[PDB]
Structure formats: C-alpha cells, structure tokens
Amino acid sequence: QIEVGEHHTATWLGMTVNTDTVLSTAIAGLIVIALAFYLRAKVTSTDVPGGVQLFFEAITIQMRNQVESAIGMRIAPFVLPLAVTIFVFILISNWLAVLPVQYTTTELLKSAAADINYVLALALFVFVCYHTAGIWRRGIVGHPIKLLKGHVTLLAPINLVEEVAKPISLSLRLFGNIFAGGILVALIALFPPYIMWAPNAIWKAFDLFVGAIQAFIFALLTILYFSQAMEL
Amino acid sequence: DPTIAAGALIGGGLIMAGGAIGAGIGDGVAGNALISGVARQPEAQGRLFTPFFITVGLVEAAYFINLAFMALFVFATPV
Amino acid sequence: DPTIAAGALIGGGLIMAGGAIGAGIGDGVAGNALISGVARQPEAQGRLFTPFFITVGLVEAAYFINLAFMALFVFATPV
Amino acid sequence: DPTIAAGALIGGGLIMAGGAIGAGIGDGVAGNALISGVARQPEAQGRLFTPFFITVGLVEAAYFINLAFMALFVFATPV
Amino acid sequence: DPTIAAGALIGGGLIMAGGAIGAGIGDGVAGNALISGVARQPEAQGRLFTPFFITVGLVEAAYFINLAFMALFVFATPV
Amino acid sequence: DPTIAAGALIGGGLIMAGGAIGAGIGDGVAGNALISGVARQPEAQGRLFTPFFITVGLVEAAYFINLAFMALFVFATPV
Amino acid sequence: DPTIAAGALIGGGLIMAGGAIGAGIGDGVAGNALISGVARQPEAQGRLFTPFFITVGLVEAAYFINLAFMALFVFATPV
Amino acid sequence: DPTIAAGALIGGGLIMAGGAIGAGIGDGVAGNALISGVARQPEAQGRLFTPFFITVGLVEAAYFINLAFMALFVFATPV
Amino acid sequence: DPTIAAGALIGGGLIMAGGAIGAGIGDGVAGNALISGVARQPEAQGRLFTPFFITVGLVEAAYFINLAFMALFVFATPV
Amino acid sequence: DPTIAAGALIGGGLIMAGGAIGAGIGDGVAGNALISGVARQPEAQGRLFTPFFITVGLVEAAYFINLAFMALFVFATPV
Numbered sequence: 001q002i003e004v005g006e007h008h009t010a011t012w013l014g015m016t017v018n019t020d021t022v023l024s025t026a027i028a029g030l031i032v033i034a035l036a037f038y039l040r041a042k043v044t045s046t047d048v049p050g051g052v053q054l055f056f057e058a059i060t061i062q063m064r065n066q067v068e069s070a071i072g073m074r075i076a077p078f079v080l081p082l083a084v085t086i087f088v089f090i091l092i093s094n095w096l097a098v099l100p101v102q103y104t105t106t107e108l109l110k111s112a113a114a115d116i117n118y119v120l121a122l123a124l125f126v127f128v129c130y131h132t133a134g135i136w137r138r139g140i141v142g143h144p145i146k147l148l149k150g151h152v153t154l155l156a157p158i159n160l161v162e163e164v165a166k167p168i169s170l171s172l173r174l175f176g177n178i179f180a181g182g183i184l185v186a187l188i189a190l191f192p193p194y195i196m197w198a199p200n201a202i203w204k205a206f207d208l209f210v211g212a213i214q215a216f217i218f219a220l221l222t223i224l225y226f227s228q229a230m231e232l
Numbered sequence: 233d234p235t236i237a238a239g240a241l242i243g244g245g246l247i248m249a250g251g252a253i254g255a256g257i258g259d260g261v262a263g264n265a266l267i268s269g270v271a272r273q274p275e276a277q278g279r280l281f282t283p284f285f286i287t288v289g290l291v292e293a294a295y296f297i298n299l300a301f302m303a304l305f306v307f308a309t310p311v
Numbered sequence: 312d313p314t315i316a317a318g319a320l321i322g323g324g325l326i327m328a329g330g331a332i333g334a335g336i337g338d339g340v341a342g343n344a345l346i347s348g349v350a351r352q353p354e355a356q357g358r359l360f361t362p363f364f365i366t367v368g369l370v371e372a373a374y375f376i377n378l379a380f381m382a383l384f385v386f387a388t389p390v
Numbered sequence: 391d392p393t394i395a396a397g398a399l400i401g402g403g404l405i406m407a408g409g410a411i412g413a414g415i416g417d418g419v420a421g422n423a424l425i426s427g428v429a430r431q432p433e434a435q436g437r438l439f440t441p442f443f444i445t446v447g448l449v450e451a452a453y454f455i456n457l458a459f460m461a462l463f464v465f466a467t468p469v
Numbered sequence: 470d471p472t473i474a475a476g477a478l479i480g481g482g483l484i485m486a487g488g489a490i491g492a493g494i495g496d497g498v499a500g501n502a503l504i505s506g507v508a509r510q511p512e513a514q515g516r517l518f519t520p521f522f523i524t525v526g527l528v529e530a531a532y533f534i535n536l537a538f539m540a541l542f543v544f545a546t547p548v
Numbered sequence: 549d550p551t552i553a554a555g556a557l558i559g560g561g562l563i564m565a566g567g568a569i570g571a572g573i574g575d576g577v578a579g580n581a582l583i584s585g586v587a588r589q590p591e592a593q594g595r596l597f598t599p600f601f602i603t604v605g606l607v608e609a610a611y612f613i614n615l616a617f618m619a620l621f622v623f624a625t626p627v
Numbered sequence: 628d629p630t631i632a633a634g635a636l637i638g639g640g641l642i643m644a645g646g647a648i649g650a651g652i653g654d655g656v657a658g659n660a661l662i663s664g665v666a667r668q669p670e671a672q673g674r675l676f677t678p679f680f681i682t683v684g685l686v687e688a689a690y691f692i693n694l695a696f697m698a699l700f701v702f703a704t705p706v
Numbered sequence: 707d708p709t710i711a712a713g714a715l716i717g718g719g720l721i722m723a724g725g726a727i728g729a730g731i732g733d734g735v736a737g738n739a740l741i742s743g744v745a746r747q748p749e750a751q752g753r754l755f756t757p758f759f760i761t762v763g764l765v766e767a768a769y770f771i772n773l774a775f776m777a778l779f780v781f782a783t784p785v
Numbered sequence: 786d787p788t789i790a791a792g793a794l795i796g797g798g799l800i801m802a803g804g805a806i807g808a809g810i811g812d813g814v815a816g817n818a819l820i821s822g823v824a825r826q827p828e829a830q831g832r833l834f835t836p837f838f839i840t841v842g843l844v845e846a847a848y849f850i851n852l853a854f855m856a857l858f859v860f861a862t863p864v
Numbered sequence: 865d866p867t868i869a870a871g872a873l874i875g876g877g878l879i880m881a882g883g884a885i886g887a888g889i890g891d892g893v894a895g896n897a898l899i900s901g902v903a904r905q906p907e908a909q910g911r912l913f914t915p916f917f918i919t920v921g922l923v924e925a926a927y928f929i930n931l932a933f934m935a936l937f938v939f940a941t942p943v
C-alpha cells in the first residue's frame with residue numbers, strides 16, 4: 001500500500017543524488033532569489049514601502065532584535081544575514097507543500113525538508129559556522145576548552161553531550177516534522193475523494209502554521225547557538 | 233520475519249506513545265506559562281513568543297526525533 | 312499474518328493510549344491557565360484565546376499525527 | 391483467530407487505560423482552576439464555566455475517540 | 470479459549486489500572502483545590518461543592534465507564 | 549489455566565500497580581494542600597479535615613475497588 | 628509451572644513498580660509542602676508533622692500493601 | 707528455567723523502572739521546595755535540610771527497597 | 786535472533802518512549818519558568834538563559850543518552 | 865537464550881525507560897526552581913547552586929544506577 005523512503009534518484013559524480021528534493025530546493029531558492037531581486041528593484045527609503053519590502057523589513061528587524069539581544073550586532077553582524085536566509089529558505093521550502101501536487105499515489109514535488117540530506121546540509125553548515133565563529137572569538141584551542149567547561153566545569157561530559165546534541169536536534173526536529181506531513185498526506189489519500197478533502201484541508205491548513213513555526217525555531221535556535229559559541 | 237514485524241509494530245507503538253505523552257504534556261505545561269503571562273500582561277503576547285517557541289522547539293524535538301525512529305522501525309526495520 | 316495482526320493491534324493501542332494521555336493532560340493543563348486567566352481578568356478573555364488556541368493547536372497536532380499512525384497500523388499495516 | 395482476538399483485547403485495554411488517565415487527570419487539572427477561581431470570587435462561577443466547558447469538551451473528546459477505537463478493536467476488529 | 474481469556478484478563482487489568490491512575494490523581498488534584506479554598510475562606514465551603522462535584526463527577530464517570538468495560542472484558546468477553 | 553493463570557497474575561499486577569500510582573499520588577497531592585493550609589494558618593486545622601477526608605475517601609475508594617478486582621482476578625479468576 | 632512463575636514475576640514486578648511510582652512521587656509532593664511551610668514560617672515545623680505524617684501514612688500504606696501482594700505473588704503464588 | 711528467567715528479567719526491569727520514576731520525580735519535587743526556600747529566605751538554607759532529608763529519606767527508601775527486590779528477582783529468583 | 790530481534794525492537798522502543806516522556810515534560814517544566822520570568826521582567830531573558838540551558842542540558846542529555854542506547858540495541862544488538 | 869536474551873533486552877529497556885523519565889522530569893522540576901529563583905532574586909545564582917546540585921545529584925544517581933543495571937542485564941546477563 002504505502003511508500004515513504006523512495007526518491008527519483010540519479011548518479012551525478014559517483015555520488016547518488018535525488019531529482020526530487022533537489023528540484024524542490026532549486027524552486028525554493030529561485031522563489032527566494034526572485035523575491036529578493038523584486039526588493040532590490042522596488043526598495044524605497046524616501047517613498048512608502050510595498051508588501052515585499054514590509055515582509056523583508058519585518059523579518060530583518062525581528063532577526064536583528066534577536067542577534068542584538070543574544071550577542072550584539074557589533075560583535076556578530078554576519079549572523080543577521082544567516083538567520084534571515086535560514087528563516088526565509090525553510091519557510092518557502094515548507095510552504096510549497098500547500099500546493100495541490102498530489103495525484104494517482106505520488107507527488108510532483110516533495111517538500112525538501114522531508115529528506116535527511118537537506119536538513120543535514122542546513123544543520124551541519126550552521127554547526128561549522130557557530131564553531132568557526134566561536135573559534136575566531138574564543139581562540140583556536142581556547143574555543144574547544146570553553147565547549148568542555150561550559151557554565152559549570154564539573155558538568156564537562158554533559159557539556160560535550162550538548163555540543164553533539166545541537167546539530168542532531170536541528171536536523172531531526174525539522175526532518176521528523178516535515179517527513180510526518182509527507183506520510184500523513186499519503187495515508188489521507190487512502191480515503192475516497194468525497195471525504196479525502198476534509199482531513200486533507202485540516203492537515204494542510206495547520207501545516208502552514210507548523211511550517212512557519214519550524215522556520216522560526218531553526219532561525220531562533222541558530223542565533224542562540226551563535227551567542228553560546230561567542231560568549232566571553 | 234513475522235515475529236520481528238510484531239516487535240517492530242509494538243516497539244514503534246511505544247516510541248509514539250512516549251513521544252505524544254512527553255510532547256503533549258510538555259506543550260500544555262509550556263503554553264500554561266504563555267496564557268498566564270498574557271493574562272498578567274495582555275500586551276506581553278509578542279514578548280513571550282520568543283521564550284515560548286524556544287520552549288516548544290525543545291519539547292517538540294522529543295516528539296519528532298521519536299517519529300523519525302518509529303518510522304525507521306515500521307517502514308525500514310533495523311533488522 | 313496473525314502474529315503481525317496482534318502486533319498491529321497492540322502497537323496501535325499504545326499509539327492512542329499515549330495520544331489520549333498527551334492530549335487530555337496537555338489540554339487540561341493549558342485550559343487550567345485559560346480558566347485562571349479569565350478569573351484574573353474578565354476582559355482579557357478574547358485576547359487569551361490566541362495563546363490558548365496556539366497551545367491547543369500544537370497539542371492537537373500531536374494527537375492528529377498519533378491518530379493517523381494508529382489508523383495506518385490497523386487499516387494499512389506497514390509490514 | 392485467538393492470537394488476533396488477544397491482540398484486540400490487549401490493544402483495546404491500552405486505548406481505554408490511556409483514555410481514563412488522560413481524561414481523569416485532564417478534568418482534575420481543569421476543575422482545580424474552576425474551584426480555585428470560585429474560592430477567589432464566588433460570583434465568578436457564571437463566567438468561569440465557559441473556559442471550563444471549552445477545556446472539558448477538548449479533554450472529553452480524547453476520551454470519546456479512544457472509547458470509539460476500543461469499541462472498534464473488540465466488536466469489529468480492524469484486521 | 471485460553472489465549473483469549475488471558476488477553477481478556479490483561480486487557481481488563483489495563484482498563485482498571487488506567488481508571489485508578491486517572492481517578493486517584495484527578496480526585497487528588499480536584500480535592501487539592503477544595504482544601505486550598507476552605508483554607509483561604511471558611512464560609513466558601515458550601516459554594517465550593519458545586520465546582521468540586523462537577524469536577525469529581527467527570528472524573529468518576531471515567532472510572533465507572535472503565536469499570537464497566539473491564540467487567541465486559543472478563544465476564545462477557547467480546548470475542 | 550497455565551496461560552489463564554499467567555494472564556490473571558499479570559492482569560492483577562496491573563490493577564494493583566495503577567491502584568498504588570493513583571492512590572499514592574492522589575493522597576500526596578491532597579495532603580500537600582492540607583499541609584499548606586496548616587502552614588498558612590493553623591487555626592484552620594479543624595475545618596480542613598472535612599475537605600481532606602472527602603478527597604482521601606474518593607482516592608482510597610479507587611484503591612480499595614482495584615484491590616477487590618485484583619483479589620477477584622488472582623483468587624477467584626473470572627475464567 | 629514456568630508459565631505461571633513468569634506471570635508471577637512480571638505481575639509481582641508491576642505491583643512494586645506502581646508502588647514506588649505512587650509512593651516516591653506521593654512523598655515528594657507531600658514533602659514539598661513540608662519544606663515550603665518551614666521556609667515561610669520557621670516555628671511551624673512541629674505542627675506541620677501532624678498533616679505530614681497523616682499524608683505520608685496514607686502514601687506509605689499503599690506501598691506496604693503493594694509490597695505484601697508482590698510477596699504473595701512471588702513466594703506464595705495464588706495459583 | 708528460560709521462561710522463568712525472561713519473567714525474572716522483565717519483572718526485575720519493571721521494579722527498577724518504577725523505582726527510578728518514583729525516585730527521580732520524588733527527589734526533583736522535594737528539591738524544588740529546597741531551592742525555592744533558599745531563594746526566598748537566604749538564611750533558611752540550614753533549617754530546610756531537616757524537612758528535605760526527611761522527604762528524600764522516604765523517597766530513597768522506596769528506591770533502595772525496589773533495588774533489593776530487583777536483585778532478589780534476577781540473582782536469587784523467588785521461583 | 787527472530788525472538789532476539791523482536792526483544793531488541795521492543796527494548797529499544799521502551800528506551801525511546803521513556804526518553805521522550807522524560808525529555809518533553811522536563812523541557813516543558815523548565816521552559817514554563819523561563820516564559821514566566823520573561824513575562825514578569827522583560828530584561829531578565831539574558832540572565833534566565835544560563836539556568837535554562839544548564840537545566841535543558843541535563844534534560845536533553847538524558848534523552849540523547851537513551852537515543853544512543855536504543856541505537857546500540859537495534860543496530861548492534863548486545864546478543 | 866532467544867528467550868533469556870529477549871527478556872534481558874526488554875528488562876534493560878524498562879530500566880532505561882524509567883531511568884530517563886525519572887531523570888528528565890526530576891531535572892526539569894529541579895531546574896524550574898533554579899530559573900524561578902534567578903528570576904525573582906537576581907543576586908541568588910551563587911547560593912542556589914548548592915540546593916540545585918544536591919537535588920540534581922540525587923536525581924542523576926537514580927539514572928546512573930539504572931544505567932549500571934541495564935548494562936548488567938544486556939552485557940553480563942544475571943541468569
């Protein structure tokens with residue numbers, strides 16, 4: 001009956017790649033790039049802002065207030081662009097699931113966060129970034145000892161377990177959440193149509209809020225992990 | 233295979249039972265503080281959001297990491 | 312098949328057991344804050360429903376996912 | 391059949407166990423706030439029944455859905 | 470029969486275990502508010518029994534319905 | 549019976565397990581309010597015992613009913 | 628005998644599992660009120676031991692009765 | 707022996723599972739009042755260790771007795 | 786292994802069930818104090834994060850340590 | 865062994881399930897008082913670490929002792 005782990009795979013460089021996930025990641029990237037070029041054309045400081053300017057201003061002021069509260073914009077200015085792109089890129093990648101792309105069952109487009117490779121690309125990039133930023137501020141060897149010491153030096157094994165748990169939590173929370181939605185839509189499609197639409201619309205409506213809340217959790221927790229890596 | 237398949241369904245059912253308990257109660261306990269804070273300060277709804285979604289993100293990890301491993305047990309069993 | 316069928320029914324029963332514990336207690340704990348908030352400020356009711364239905368919506372999302380996976384186990388068994 | 395029937399009785403027993411845990415604690419936790427608000431202000435009783443019966447409606451619903459799936463498992467076994 | 474009778478005894482045991490957990494904790498949590506209300510205001514005793522017996526009636530309904538389904542399982546087994 | 553007796557012992561063990569969880573936590577939660585009432589004003593000690601023994605009477609009753617149905621299951625097994 | 632003996636060890640293990648959950652949480656919840664009374668009013672220690680040992684006597688009675696029925700199940704098995 | 711041995715390991719596992727739930731939650735709930743007492747009354751750190759170690763003594767006695775009966779089940783099995 | 790693999794899946798499922806219960810509730814209970822502290826004092830967030838992430842560090846370590854022992858049971862089974 | 869080894873994995877899984885429930889909730893409940901103390905009394909963070917690590921040491925002792933007995937059950941099985 002059901003299927004879940006399958007992908008439209010290809011070999012690109014001896015490495016095995018998914019055609020789905022990658023095209024969905026490309027569509028999310030192209031939508032975010034197009035929306036950013038629309039801002040670059042239409043942005044006004046003198047004249048009253050349009051909706052796309054109001055959107056990026058609301059996200060930028062929100063993520064700036066978080067960076068400024070957590071660590072300071074003078075210390076960590078590179079975290080603001082990263083928090084903004086993490087939010088907007090996850091948000092669009094999640095919200096593309098609202099499209100009616102299911103058919104007799106298969107979908108023309110998976111949400112990219114239903115693939116472990118996508119969430120590892122985001123989480124392991126963020127992990128390398130806050131450790132590299134943490135080293136550039138806490139020292140090459142000074143940083144690694146502060147990761148062990150934490151706030152209470154006797155807890156050093158628990159502090160090491162926290163540093164291992166962060167990239168795994170970022171990965172598997174985002175994956176497990178969007179992957180759950182991917183399983184729910186195929187088991188809802190076991191209903192006949194006269195009734196299928198009601199559980200489907202209930203799920204897709206809450207999956208818009210959940211898809212936005214995910215994007216926000218990943219962006220907030222990214223800013224906090226930068227603040228912990230750059231403290232003292 | 234059939235004894236392993238029953239173990240996968242019972243083991244997977246445990247993972248989702250403990251996930252829903254942990255996260256459903258954890259979100260009720262976290263959201264109780266949001267509703268109480270806004271009740272003390274109506275205008276503080278926006279302020280609590282950040283602490284609230286930090287808390288919900290930590291609680292919901294226990295659900296969704298469990299859901300990843302339940303799905304592994306029932307769709308792609310470790311044995 | 313009968314071993315897998317018993318595992319599906321026990322596994323599906325665990326999923327809805329943990330579902331009702333998580334949801335019933337999570338909703339009771341969130342609703343305790345709504346009742347206590349409307350005790351403190353009668354005019355806050357309409358505002359307190361935003362924190363409450365955010366909290367209950369997150370708790371009920373976990374119940375709806377558990378309900379979906381129990382239905383999968385018993386009507387469309389994964390193994 | 392006997393293995394499927396025992397799985398249905400254990401599975402149905404889990405569903406109603408988690409149902410009464412979720413409902414009994416959810417209702418006790420919700421009603422604790424009603425009793426506390428009527429201790430604080432005797433008249434409040436008329437306004438506090440709205441937050442209370444919203445909460446009790448959500449908590450009962452988890453009991454009634456579990457009761458319906460237990461009844462399905464033992465009287466009309468899905469497998 | 471012997472497999473179904475053992476499953477009925479374990480299934481009925483689960484129903485009464487979850488019934489007593491839900492009821493004993495639900496009544497303790499409801500009664501904690503009654504004792505705390507009579508602590509703060511002695512003259513409230515009479516009025517507090519309406520919120521209390523509304524809450525206890527909901528908790529005791531979940532116990533009695535579980536007790537009825539346990540009795541069905543072990544004396545009048547559904548299969 | 550070897551199989552029915554094992555199900556009767558596991559079923560009876562579940563009944564007394566959930567019985568003691570419900571009882572011990574219900575009594576601790578009710579007694580926490582009694583101790584906190586006598587802590588805030590000791591002149592209340594004579595009045596608080598009616599709310600307390602109403603609460604403990606309900607919590608104990610759930611223990612005694614579980615203890616009676618465990619005794620039925622192990623000494624006078626329904627099959 | 629081995630099937631009945633395994634049922635007696637699992638059933639006996641459940642009785643002592645539920646006893647320690649009930650008692651350890653019930654005593655922690657009662658003792659939280661004792662510690663909080665002595666924090667706020669240091670002279671109250673002597674009077675609070677009456678509400679405390681009334682509470683703890685009820686909680687520990689559930690533990691000791693469970694310990695007695697576990698001992699019956701494993702040493703003096705009802706079948 | 708092997709079916710009794712599986713029952714001894716599952717039975718002993720239940721005893722230490724319920725032991726650690728009773729202990730860890732009982733100790734956290736007791737210690738929450740100790741930490742809160744030293745927060746409010748900064749000179750109360752001392753007097754509080756008597757109510758705290760009375761509470762922890764009751765909670766840890768349930769853990770040690772469960773540890774003793776688990777050791778009996780797995781090393782010196784009652785059957 | 787057919788039976789050892791089923792025992793590994795049920796055992797690994799238990800490890801992750803208790804992991805998510807402990808973690809989801811422990812984080813919700815810790816985050817309730819963060820949300821309430823930032824509700825009462827908006828500038829307190831920065832000082833409250835340190836206690837919060839010490840607490841969340843201990844709670845998230847428990848679940849993750851379990852996640853590692855579940856992975857041992859199901860991928861590299863001790864028998 | 866298929867039976868003893870499966871009983872060891874289920875028994876060891878129960879030990880670590882109850883371990884993580886007791887630990888995660890005990891640490892969350894203890895750290896809730898630490899975060900609340902650093903909220904209300906901002907100077908207290910030095911004095912609160914003694915009550916906090918006394919409480920966490922008691923809670924983590926139950927987890928580590930459970931981990932030691934799970935390790936015994938699966939690597940060095942008592943029977």
Ligand SMILES: COc1nc2ccc(Br)cc2cc1[C@@H](c1ccccc1)[C@@](O)(CCN(C)C)c1cccc2ccccc12
Pocket residue numbers: 199202203206207334368371372374375448451452455
């Ligand atoms: C508040 O209700 C919801 N909120 C949600 C929020 C998010 C998501 Br993603 C799913 C949600 C789903 C629902 C309900 C719903 C309504 C309609 C169709 C399907 C599901 C619900 O699941 C509630 C269960 N709770 C109360 C225990 C339900 C299920 C089954 C039977 C019901 C019978 C009666 C009432 C509700 C019933």
Ligand SMILES: COc1nc2ccc(Br)cc2cc1[C@@H](c1ccccc1)[C@@](O)(CCN(C)C)c1cccc2ccccc12
Pocket residue numbers: 413446447448450451453454526527528530531534
């Ligand atoms: C408050 O009552 C409700 N509110 C609900 C709210 C939402 C939904 Br969707 C379902 C609800 C259902 C009910 C009851 C009901 C009334 C009539 C028929 C069916 C169900 C109930 O389920 C309550 C159980 N509680 C109290 C543990 C019940 C079930 C079975 C036997 C009962 C016997 C006596 C009384 C109530 C009985």
Ligand SMILES: COc1nc2ccc(Br)cc2cc1[C@@H](c1ccccc1)[C@@](O)(CCN(C)C)c1cccc2ccccc12
Pocket residue numbers: 492525526529530532533534606609610613
């Ligand atoms: C308060 O009592 C109730 N309130 C209810 C409220 C709603 C509903 Br719908 C059912 C309710 C049922 C009852 C009792 C009752 C009284 C008479 C007959 C049947 C049931 C009860 O179930 C209480 C159990 N509690 C206390 C754990 C009970 C059951 C069995 C044996 C008892 C022995 C002694 C006393 C009570 C006994």
Ligand SMILES: COc1nc2ccc(Br)cc2cc1[C@@H](c1ccccc1)[C@@](O)(CCN(C)C)c1cccc2ccccc12
Pocket residue numbers: 571604605608609611612613685688689692
């Ligand atoms: C408070 O005591 C009660 N209140 C009740 C309230 C309602 C109902 Br309907 C039954 C109630 C029953 C009792 C006791 C009782 C007293 C005498 C005979 C039978 C039952 C009890 O059940 C208490 C168990 N609790 C404390 C865990 C008990 C049972 C078994 C052995 C006991 C040994 C010592 C003490 C109490 C013992």
Ligand SMILES: COc1nc2ccc(Br)cc2cc1[C@@H](c1ccccc1)[C@@](O)(CCN(C)C)c1cccc2ccccc12
Pocket residue numbers: 650684687688690691692764767768769771
């Ligand atoms: C407070 O102690 C009690 N109060 C009770 C109250 C009511 C009833 Br009816 C029985 C009660 C029984 C006891 C103890 C007791 C003392 C002596 C003999 C038998 C039982 C106890 O059961 C306490 C267990 N708790 C603490 C988890 C116990 C059992 C086993 C071994 C123990 C070893 C050391 C200490 C206590 C030990």
Ligand SMILES: COc1nc2ccc(Br)cc2cc1[C@@H](c1ccccc1)[C@@](O)(CCN(C)C)c1cccc2ccccc12
Pocket residue numbers: 157158161843846847848850887921924925927928929931
């Ligand atoms: C606070 O840490 C402790 N405090 C204790 C207090 C008392 C006693 Br008697 C034992 C204690 C043991 C420990 C840890 C420890 C540290 C070193 C070796 C062995 C045990 C711990 O058990 C903590 C588990 N908790 C957090 C769920 C642990 C176990 C296994 C793997 C870990 C990996 C990373 C970190 C901690 C790890």
Ligand SMILES: COc1nc2ccc(Br)cc2cc1[C@@H](c1ccccc1)[C@@](O)(CCN(C)C)c1cccc2ccccc12
Pocket residue numbers: 729763766767769770771773922925926929
């Ligand atoms: C506070 O410690 C106690 N208080 C008690 C109070 C009453 C009674 Br009657 C028994 C008590 C027993 C103990 C310990 C103890 C100390 C020495 C020997 C035996 C038992 C303990 O049981 C604590 C377990 N807790 C913390 C989960 C323990 C058991 C096993 C291994 C341990 C290893 C390290 C530390 C403690 C260890």
